[PDB]
UniProtKB/Swiss-Prot annotation, chain A:
Gene encoding the protein: RpL18A
Superkingdom of origin: Eukaryota
GO process terms (BP): cytoplasmic translation
Keywords from the UniProt entry: Ribonucleoprotein, Ribosomal protein
A UniProt-annotated Pfam family: Ribosomal_L18A
Annotated family: Belongs to the eukaryotic ribosomal protein eL20 family.
Protein name: Large ribosomal subunit protein eL20
Gene3D superfamilies associated with the record: 3.10.20.10
Single GO molecular function: structural constituent of ribosome
Keyword Ribonucleoprotein: yes
Source species of the chain: Drosophila melanogaster
A cellular component term, taken from the record's GO annotations: cytosolic large ribosomal subunit
Swiss-Prot record, chain B:
This protein's record includes keyword Ribonucleoprotein: yes
Organism in which the protein naturally occurs: Drosophila melanogaster (Fruit fly)
Pfam families xrefs: Ribosomal_L13
Tree of life domain: Eukaryota
Biological-process GO terms, alphabetical: cytoplasmic translation; negative regulation of translation
Family to which this protein belongs: Belongs to the universal ribosomal protein uL13 family.
Molecular functions per Gene Ontology: mRNA binding; structural constituent of ribosome
Organism taxonomic ancestry: Eukaryota, Metazoa, Ecdysozoa, Arthropoda, Hexapoda
GO cellular component terms, A-Z: cytosolic large ribosomal subunit; cytosolic ribosome; ribosome
SUPFAM superfamilies: Ribosomal protein L13 (SSF52161)
Keyword check for Transmembrane: no
Protein name: Large ribosomal subunit protein uL13
PANTHER family listed in its UniProt record: LARGE RIBOSOMAL SUBUNIT PROTEIN UL13 (PTHR11545:SF3), RIBOSOMAL PROTEIN L13 (PTHR11545)
Record key words, sorted: Ribonucleoprotein, Ribosomal protein
Curated annotation (Swiss-Prot), chain D:
Family label: Belongs to the eukaryotic ribosomal protein eL14 family.
The UniProt record lists the keyword Ribonucleoprotein: yes
GO annotation (BP), single: negative regulation of neuron apoptotic process
Alphabetical list of SUPFAM superfamilies matching this protein: Translation proteins SH3-like domain (SSF50104)
Organism: Drosophila melanogaster
InterPro entries referenced in this protein's UniProt entry, alphabetically: Rib_uL2_dom2, Ribosomal_eL14, Ribosomal_eL14_dom, Translation_prot_SH3-like_sf
Name under which the protein is recorded: Large ribosomal subunit protein eL14
Underlying gene: RpL14
Pfam families linked: Ribosomal_L14e (PF01929)
UniProtKB/Swiss-Prot annotation, chain E:
Record's protein name: Large ribosomal subunit protein uL6
A single GO cellular-component term on record: cytosolic large ribosomal subunit
Gene3D superfamilies, per database record: Ribosomal protein L6, alpha-beta domain
InterPro entries according to UniProt: Ribosomal_uL6-like (IPR000702), Ribosomal_uL6-like_a/b-dom_sf (IPR036789), Ribosomal_uL6_a/b-dom (IPR020040), Ribosomal_uL6_CS2 (IPR002359)
MF annotations from Gene Ontology: rRNA binding; structural constituent of ribosome
Keywords associated with the record: Ribonucleoprotein, Ribosomal protein
One GO process term, biological-process aspect: cytoplasmic translation
Family: Belongs to the universal ribosomal protein uL6 family.
Keyword presence, Ribosomal protein: yes
Length: 173, 205, 78, 159, 190
RNA sequence: AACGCCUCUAAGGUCGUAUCCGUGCUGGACUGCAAUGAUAAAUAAGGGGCAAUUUGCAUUGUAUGGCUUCUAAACCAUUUAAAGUUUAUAAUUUACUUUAUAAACGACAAUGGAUGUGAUGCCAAUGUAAUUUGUAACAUAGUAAAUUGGGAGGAUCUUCGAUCACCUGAUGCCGCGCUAGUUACAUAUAAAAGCAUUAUUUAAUACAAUGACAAAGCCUAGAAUCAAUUGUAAACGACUUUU
RNA sequence: AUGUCGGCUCUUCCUAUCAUUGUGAAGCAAAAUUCACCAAGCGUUGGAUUGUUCACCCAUGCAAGGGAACGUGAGCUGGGU
RNA sequence: AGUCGAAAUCCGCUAAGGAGUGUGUAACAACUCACCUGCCGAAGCAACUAGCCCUUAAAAUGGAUGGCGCUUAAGUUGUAU
RNA sequence: UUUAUCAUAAAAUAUAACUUAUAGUUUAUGCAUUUUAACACAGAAUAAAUGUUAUUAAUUUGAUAAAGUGCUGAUAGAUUUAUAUGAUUACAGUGCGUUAAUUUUUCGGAAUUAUAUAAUGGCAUAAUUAUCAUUGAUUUUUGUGU
C-alpha cells in the first residue's frame, strides 16, 4: 500500500475486579485499515499482559497528515532485524508527507538490507526541523537555492514506433 | 514498394545492441518481417574487450568430440554472430521456425541495395538508450577480429570507398535541395496556393 | 495500446486464400470463383498492447501464421 | 559550462508523463534525487508530489522565494508575462500541433491535401530550371529556346 | 549516495589559445600543440567563456566523481608540456662492465650494448614527439625530450624494464637503468 | 586521484609467455559459390535461340472498387547518457576542414514520420470510375519528347556487371502532347426493389508474370557418356591420356 | 545371463605440476635448490624376479608426477583365478 | 655516559627538551622524535556491526539459470497495477 | 490542507542601493564601462515571505461504503412432438360509459382535491418495559393529538 497512518487504542475487557482499564495507545503506519487491527496486538504484546481476546480495539483513527504542501522532512527511528544482528537504528528520508515517509523507508530498508517487513517496527517518527540530520545523502538538498541541471526524463523507451525514423538523440541542447 | 508491413525493414547498427535488437527483430519475424540488419561492425555487448571474448571462447572450445565436422558450426564473420542470438529464439526444428530464416538476411559491409534504401532506428536497442555511463562495453567488429574474422580491414578498403562516394552525393543534393526553396520563391504567388497549408501544418510548415 | 484496439470490438474477421477450381456459378453477386475465404468475428481486447483475439466461422486453417488476413469495418459506429 | 537546462526554482515547465500532460507548471523545490514539488497557479492544478522524470523543462526561470505561497506566484507569473511570450516561442508554434493538428478533421482534409497536388502541380515546371553552368545552351535547346522564350523576355513568342 | 556537484576551474596563462571540441582538450603554446582525447572517460567540462577552463561531474557515486581532479591533473601537466616540455634522466649505474649507451638522430630512440659485455643488442624504440639524447658534460647520463607526460616516463619506463638481470638475486646485482630527476625543459631555469 | 599527501587503478595508455585464437600446411554448404568456354544431328527439312519483345487467345500475381500508393535518393564521414548538436559570420582549409564569435536550440507540449527530409502520391477529370466526357473565353506560368560521333562514370553472394547512367562532337527542327486559377457552353455515361444487400467478396482497367496455339522478323551450325585403350592410378568405379 | 582380474596395442581427456616457456619469493653471493602464482602445448622411459596395481632394484636421464568411464576378450593372451 | 635491558626518579631548564625516541647503534657522541608554535583553515579519525559482489573453490566425452541472452537489466530485494 | 481575511511576529531567502574581488575590457599599472552564473545577510525598503493566532470563499482537499445515478458499447449461448397420455391461463398494458377549474401547448396534453383506511413516518404529550449510562440518551409497550 501507500502506508497510511492509524492511531489505535486497546481495551482489556472490563472485568469486574478492576473496571475501567487504562486504554493504551499506539501510532501505527500500515498498508491497510484492516491490517493494523492485528498489528496493534503485536506491538501491545511487548509491554502489558493484555492478550486478544481479553481486550477490544476501540476506534482506529486515520489521521490525515496536516502539512502536505510544505516540504518538511522527518527522521525515523528504526528497528531492523537482518540475519542475526537485530538492533536499534536511526535514519531519515526526506519525503513530502509522513505516509510517503514510511513506504519509502520500508522500500529502502528492503532495498539495501533485505530486512523483510516481518522484522521492522516503526518505533518513532519525528518531524526534524533542520541542522540535526547526519545523513549525507539528504542534507545537501537543504541548500536552497540550487542550480541543478540534472536533466532527466522518464526515459519512456522510446515510444510507439518500434521501427522509428528519427534517431533518439537524448541530450537535446 | 510493398510487403506485409513494408517490403523490408533495414536496421543500422551503431549502438543498436545485439540483444535488445534480436529479441525485437525475432518476435517481429514471426509476424511478417522480410527484414535485414546491416552495418553490423559496430554493435555492442556488455562486459568488456577481454571479458566477452571469454564468452566467445567457451563456445569456440565446444567441438564435437568424435567427428568434429559433426557438431558445432561456429561462424567467424561478424554477420552470423548476430544470428547466434536469432537461432536460439526461433525453434528451428519446425518447418515454420525455418519460415523466417529465408526472410532474414544479416549484413556487415552495407552493400547490395541495403546501401541506398533508407535505414531506420529501433529505440530500446540503442547503446545510448539502455547503457549507463562508465559501464564499459566490447565491440563486435573489434572483438570478432580477435576471435578470428579475417576481414576487419577488408571492409574498410571499401567502406571508405562508399563513405567517400557518399560525400559527393550529399553535395549532389546539397544545392539541389536548396534549389527547391529557391524555386519555392517562384511558386508562393501561384494563384493563392498557401493558406490551405498555413492553416494546417503552418508552424514552420 | 489497449485504448487503440477496443475500436476493433465486434468487427467481422475475414481471410482469403487461393485454390484451384471454381465449382460454383456466379449467381449471388458475380463470381467466376477463383478466390476462397472462410469467415468470422473478432471479440475482445486481450494483450496489454493491442493484440485482440478473434473467432472464426470454422477454425483458421492452420497454415496461415504469417498470411495477410484482414479486418473490414463492418459493423462500426462513431 | 555550456549554459544547460537548469532545473532551478522557480522555472516553469511543461510535463509530459503524468496527469500534467497538457499543463504548464513551475518548480517549488527539489525533493530528492527523483522528486519535485511543482505548481502552476494559472493553469488549474495546485502543488503535489511529482517525479523529476515525468516532466520536461522550459527555459524561463522566474524568481521566487523557495518557501513561497502560491499567491505571489499567482502574482509573479502574470508579472513575468509568460502568457504573452509563451505562444510566440518559435517551437511552441510547433506546440500548436497539439492545439490545431489535434484530430485533423475529415471535413476539410481534401482541401488540406489536394492543395499539395496544387503546390506540386507548379513545382516540377520550376524544375529542370538548372543553373548548372549549361548555360549555354545544350542543343536541341534550339527547339526548346522557344519554350524558354516564355520564361525570360517574355514578349512575345519564340522567336 | 549520488552526491550532487563538484567542479574545478584552473587558472590559465595568457600565452596560450586552448579549446575543447566538446570532449577533446587541445592547448597550443610555445613548443606547438598537444591534444589528447577524452571522448570516453565520462566527464563534462567547458571553458567558462574565458581563458580559464571549468569541469563538472553531475551525480556521481564515488569512483565517478573521483575524475574531476584527474582530468584537471591530466591537463595541468599539459600546460607544462606545450610551453616547457618534459625531460627525464637515466643515470646508468653499473658494477663492473661500463655500459655503452649511444644515441643518434633520428634514429633518436636508443642504441645500447655491453650488458654484461654480452651478445644481445638490447634495443628500445620510442613514442612520437619524444627524443632520447645522451647527456653531455656528465658521465653516462641521458636526456629525454617531449611534451606528453604520459609518454616521456613510459619511454623512460621502456628503458627501465630493459635491461634486467635474469634468474639471480637482484639484491646482489643492482645494475639497471634508473630515472633520477623529473624535469621540464624550460621551466624555470631549463 | 575521490583519500591536499602518497599510491602499478579510481576510470586511461603499455612491456609478456610452449597457453589460446589466425596465417602457415590438409579435406572443402556430399551437389554451396565465382567469372570463363563451347553450345549441337543438319544445313532439303528441322532443332535451338534472340524474346525481356512487335501480334491475339488463354493464365497467374500485385494496388481490389482509380488509388488499404508509395518511393529503392539523406542525418556523423574514429567516436559520446551532464555528454551536446544545427545553421550563421569571419580567418583557415581539399573538405559545413580547422579556428573564433553570434545565437538558434533548451534530453519541452513537438520529436517516435508526413522535414512524405532530389521535398510524396490521392492523377491530366477542367460529370474524376467497379469506362473515356468534351468546346470556348480569361489571366498568369509555361514543361514533357524523339534521330548523328568522341570522352569523364558505375560492382561488396548481381531485381541485366561484354553493357550501363552523365557530358560533349553533332545529326536534327516535336514546335506531336504541357499544367494551374476564373467564367460560360456541347454532351455522353452513370441507379444490381438491394432498401435492417453484402458474401465460397467479383474483379475489369493497368501492371508485370507468363505459358500454349497458327500467328512476328531475326540468330544458330556441338559435346558428353561408357565401351576399346593406356599407365603418372587401381579391391572395384573413379582419376591422367590417346587416336 | 552386462563374458569378471592383469599386462600388450591404442585413441583420449584431467588438474591438486615432475620437469621444460614467463615471473615472483627466500636465511636467493654464484653454482645449486626450495616456495608460490599462471600454465595442459609435446614429453614422463629400456630391464632382474614375480601373474600383478603398488612394492623394491639396475640404468638412461644436464630431469622420469598423479588420474578417468574397473578404460578394452565378437582385438588378443589365459600366467594366476 | 640518555639510549640491548633499567630498580627507579624527580625535576631544573622552559610555549615545548622526557634518567629520553631511535636504525639486532658494545663507549662519549652523532642524531631526529614526542612535544609546543609556524604553516592550512572544513570536517577528520579509532574500532565496531552487516546487504550484495570478493577470496575461498580442484575433474576426468564438449554443453548447460532450460536455450537464446542480458548489466541506470531480462540481474539478487521490497512492491505498486 | 488550500484560498481569502486576522493581529502581531521577527525577518533563514526572493524583488530591492552601491562595494569589493574576478576575468574579459577603454584610455593613459590603475581607472572608464561591460558578465557577475565572486555576486561582500553589503544597505534599507519590500514579499510584514518565513514565524503566531483565529476566521473563511462556489466554506476547501480525497479517500470508503450506499441509491437504476445514468447509460453507452460487445462477446458466445437460447431447452422445449407442453397429450405426438392433460390451464395456452393469469398478471399487468390498451380503446369504450361522472366531474370541476387551475395551468400550459394551444394539435393533443396539462394540472385539482376532498373519496376510504391499519395508517407508516414528521411533531407533540401521556404512558410504561428496559438500558452503557442517567443533563441524559437508547429504547419497549403503547396511548392520543397534530
Amino acid at each position: 500500500g501507500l502506508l497510511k497512518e492509524y492511531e489505535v487504542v486497546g481495551r482489556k475487557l472490563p472485568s469486574e475486579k478492576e473496571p475501567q482499564t487504562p486504554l493504551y495507545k499506539m501510532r501505527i503506519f500500515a498498508p491497510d485499515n484492516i491490517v493494523a487491527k492485528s498489528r496493534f496486538w503485536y506491538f501491545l504484546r511487548q509491554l502489558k499482559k493484555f492478550k486478544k481476546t481479553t481486550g477490544e480495539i476501540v476506534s482506529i483513527k486515520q489521521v490525515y497528515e496536516t502539512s502536505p504542501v510544505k516540504i518538511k522532512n522527518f527522521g525515523i527511528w528504526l528497528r531492523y532485524d537482518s540475519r542475526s544482528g537485530t538492533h536499534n537504528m536511526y535514519r531519515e528520508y526526506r519525503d513530502l508527507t509522513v505516509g510517503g515517509a514510511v513506504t519509502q523507508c520500508y522500500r529502502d530498508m528492503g532495498a539495501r538490507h533485505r530486512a523483510r517487513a516481518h522484522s521492522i517496527q516503526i518505533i518513532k517518527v519525528d518531524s526534524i526541523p533542520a541542522a540535526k540530520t547526519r545523513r549525507v545523502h539528504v542534507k545537501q538538498f537543504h541548500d536552497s537555492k540550487i542550480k541543478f541541471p540534472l536533466v532527466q526524463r522518464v526515459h519512456h523507451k522510446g515510444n510507439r514506433k518500434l521501427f522509428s525514423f528519427r534517431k533518439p538523440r537524448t541530450y537535446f541542447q | 514498394m510493398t510487403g506485409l508491413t513494408n517490403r523490408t525493414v533495414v536496421i543500422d547498427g551503431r549502438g543498436h545492441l545485439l540483444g535488445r535488437l534480436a529479441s525485437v527483430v525475432a518476435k517481429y519475424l514471426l509476424q511478417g518481417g522480410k527484414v535485414a540488419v546491416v552495418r553490423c561492425e559496430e554493435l555492442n555487448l556488455s562486459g568488456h574487450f577481454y571479458r566477452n571474448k571469454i564468452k566467445f571462447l567457451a563456445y569456440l572450445r565446444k567441438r564435437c568430440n568424435v567427428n568434429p565436422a559433426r557438431g558445432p558450426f561456429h561462424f567467424r564473420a561478424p554477420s552470423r554472430i548476430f544470428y547466434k542470438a536469432v537461432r536460439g529464439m526461433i525453434p528451428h526444428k519446425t518447418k515454420r521456425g525455418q519460415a523466417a530464416l529465408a526472410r532474414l538476411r544479416v549484413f556487415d559491409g552495407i552493400p547490395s541495395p541495403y546501401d541506398k534504401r533508407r535505414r531506420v532506428v529501433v529505440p530500446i536497442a540503442m547503446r545510448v538508450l539502455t547503457l549507463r555511463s562508465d559501464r564499459k562495453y566490447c565491440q563486435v567488429g573489434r572483438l570478432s577480429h580477435e576471435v578470428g574474422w579475417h576481414y576487419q580491414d577488408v571492409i574498410k578498403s571499401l567502406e571508405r570507398k562508399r563513405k567517400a562516394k557518399l560525400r559527393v552525393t550529399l553535395k549532389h543534393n546539397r544545392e539541389l535541395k536548396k534549389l527547391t526553396v529557391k524555386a519555392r520563391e517562384n511558386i508562393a504567388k501561384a494563384a493563392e496556393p498557401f493558406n490551405k497549408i498555413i492553416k494546417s501544418y503552418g508552424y514552420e510548415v | 495500446r489497449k485504448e487503440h484496439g477496443s475500436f476493433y470490438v465486434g468487427k467481422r474477421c475475414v481471410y482469403v486464400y487461393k485454390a484451384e477450381t471454381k465449382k460454383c456459378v456466379p449467381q449471388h453477386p458475380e463470381r467466376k470463383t477463383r478466390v476462397r475465404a472462410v469467415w468470422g468475428k473478432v471479440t475482445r481486447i486481450h494483450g496489454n498492447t493491442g493484440a485482440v483475439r478473434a473467432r472464426f466461422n470454422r477454425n483458421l486453417p492452420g497454415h496461415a501464421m504469417g498470411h495477410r488476413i484482414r479486418i473490414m469495418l463492418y459493423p462500426s459506429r462513431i | 559550462m555550456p549554459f544547460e537546462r537548469f532545473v532551478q526554482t522557480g522555472r516553469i515547465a511543461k510535463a509530459s508523463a503524468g496527469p500534467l500532460k497538457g499543463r504548464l507548471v513551475a518548480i517549488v523545490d527539489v525533493i530528492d534525487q527523483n522528486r519535485v514539488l511543482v505548481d502552476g497557479p494559472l493553469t488549474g492544478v495546485p502543488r503535489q508530489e511529482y517525479r523529476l522524470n515525468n516532466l520536461h523543462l522550459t527555459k524561463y526561470r522566474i524568481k521566487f522565494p523557495y518557501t513561497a505561497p502560491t499567491r505571489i506566484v499567482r502574482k509573479a507569473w502574470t508579472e513575468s508575462d509568460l502568457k504573452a511570450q509563451w505562444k510566440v516561442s518559435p517551437w511552441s508554434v510547433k506546440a500548436q500541433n497539439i492545439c490545431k493538428r489535434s484530430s485533423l478533421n475529415d471535413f476539410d482534409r481534401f482541401k488540406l491535401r489536394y492543395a499539395k497536388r496544387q503546390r506540386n502541380k507548379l513545382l516540377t515546371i520550376a524544375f529542370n530550371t538548372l543553373k548548372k553552368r549549361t548555360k549555354a545552351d545544350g542543343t536541341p535547346r534550339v527547339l526548346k529556346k522557344d519554350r524558354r522564350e516564355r520564361l525570360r523576355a517574355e514578349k512575345a513568342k519564340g522567336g | 549516495m549520488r552526491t550532487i556537484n563538484s567542479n574545478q576551474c584552473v587558472k590559465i596563462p595568457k600565452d596560450i589559445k586552448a579549446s575543447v571540441k566538446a570532449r577533446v582538450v587541445t592547448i597550443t603554446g610555445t613548443r606547438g600543440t598537444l591534444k589528447r582525447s577524452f571522448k570516453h572517460l565520462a566527464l563534462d567540462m567547458y571553458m567558462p567563456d574565458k581563458r580559464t577552463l571549468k569541469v563538472e561531474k553531475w551525480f556521481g557515486t564515488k569512483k565517478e566523481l573521483a575524475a574531476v581532479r584527474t582530468v584537471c591533473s591530466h591537463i595541468e601537466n599539459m600546460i607544462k608540456g606545450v610551453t616547457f616540455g618534459f625531460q627525464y634522466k637515466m643515470r646508468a649505474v653499473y658494477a663492473h662492465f661500463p655500459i655503452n649507451c649511444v644515441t643518434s638522430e633520428n634514429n633518436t630512440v636508443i642504441e645500447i650494448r655491453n650488458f654484461l659485455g654480452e651478445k644481445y643488442i638490447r634495443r628500445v624504440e620510442m613514442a612520437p614527439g619524444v627524443t632520447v639524447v645522451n647527456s653531455t658534460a656528465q658521465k653516462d647520463e641521458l636526456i629525454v625530450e617531449g611534451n606528453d607526460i604520459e609518454s616521456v616516463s613510459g619511454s623512460a619506463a621502456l628503458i627501465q624494464q630493459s635491461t634486467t638481470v635474469k634468474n639471480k638475486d637482484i639484491r646482489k646485482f643492482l645494475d639497471g637503468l634508473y630515472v633520477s630527476e623529473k624535469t621540464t625543459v624550460v621551466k624555470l631555469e631549463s
